[PDB]
Every structure is written in structure tokens, then in C-alpha cells.
């Protein structure tokens, strides 16, 4: 996923500049700020994930 972020970030924009490349399909996708909730520490402060 780190390498797929590197592809989607900055070898995807110069690759479609070239004469002849139509649509394309990168493997994987870019990043996401992925948040890992802890259920015991959600219990500890009286919080639902909603």
C-alpha cells in the first residue's frame, strides 16, 4: 500500500502526459487516514464509535 500510494501520487500524473496512453488501472489504491478504534479504551471513556 505504501508503494501503491507512491504510484498513485507521483508516477500517475506524468504517465498520462505521454502520447498514446489511454485509460489505465493502477493496482491497489492511494492512502487513507485509517483510524483503529480500541474497544477497551472506548469502554473506558463511555463512548460508542458512532
Amino acid at each position: 500500500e505504501d508503494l501503491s500510494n507512491y504510484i498513485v501520487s507521483n508516477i500517475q500524473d506524468p504517465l498520462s502526459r505521454t502520447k498514446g496512453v489511454g485509460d489505465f488501472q493502477v493496482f491497489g489504491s492511494q492512502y487513507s487516514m485509517r483510524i483503529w478504534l480500541d474497544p477497551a479504551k472506548l469502554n473506558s471513556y463511555q463512548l460508542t464509535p458512532g
Binding site: Y6, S9, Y31
Partner: protein, 52 residues
């Protein structure tokens, strides 16, 4: 502003010397004994003045 603790051997790196990688981990470059530059991923947590 409470103060607790004191470090004996604390390594204070400047803010222009440590940056952020695209993954988010704080990185800072190091030159070696054979005079080449090299990258090691560090754990920068607090700021003191203008120094990580």
C-alpha cells in the same frame, strides 16, 4: 505548564533537519563515516523551542 523529569543524554535535532515521509513517519538524514548520506526513521515526539 507543569514540568516533570530531566533527561541526561537527550538528543535535540533541529526542525529543518527532520521532516515527514509520505507515510507519516518522521525521518532525518545522516551522513556516514565513508561520507555518503543515509536515511533512518526516527521517533520525534516533542518540540523544545525550535528543536525536535
Amino acid at each position: 505548564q507543569l514540568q516533570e523529569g530531566v533527561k541526561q543524554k537527550a538528543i535535540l535535532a533541529p526542525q529543518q533537519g527532520v521532516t515527514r515521509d509520505l507515510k507519516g513517519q518522521a525521518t532525518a538524514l545522516v551522513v556516514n563515516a565513508q561520507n555518503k548520506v543515509e536515511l533512518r526513521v526516527i521517533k520525534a515526539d516533542r518540540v523544545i523551542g525550535d528543536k525536535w
